[PDB]
Nucleic acid binder design. Structure first.
Lengths: 56, 53
DNA sequence: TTTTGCCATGTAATTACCTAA
DNA sequence: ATTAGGTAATTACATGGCAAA
């Protein structure tokens, strides 16, 4: 699976979503994937890493 | 589809340690003639079943 | 009882995704 | 993002019961 740089608009929307809830449901992750032009697995791993860093 | 003998030994093991160590997973796989993935999944399913008691 | 046959229950495997390194 | 060890829900289908002619 290729690494990818997220455009600032993508990170903005992801942090916006993460600010409300650090956990993403499957249906919402699909909606976001389609809205941001991002693979679901990228959104899923982003959230996973984000939660781990916020824990430090 | 596990045998009566495989299931008895897996149960005996589970009773002693409900969590698999790498070495125990290896031993069981060898002695019972099963793949380590099957030993792993059996223990995971078992813990989930016991949790429904 | 035999024996057919059908559904409910059990379970191995799969899917999905979490934390942690 | 990967690898690993776990839970939880679900799938896929094996099989135990039991009903009944």
């Amino acid at each position: 699976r290729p690494r990818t740089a997220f455009s600032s608009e993508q990170l903005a929307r992801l942090k916006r979503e993460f600010n409300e809830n650090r956990y993403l449901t499957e249906r919402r992750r699909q909606q976001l994937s389609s809205e941001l032009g991002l693979n679901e697995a990228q959104i899923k791993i982003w959230f996973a890493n984000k939660r781990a860093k916020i824990k430090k």
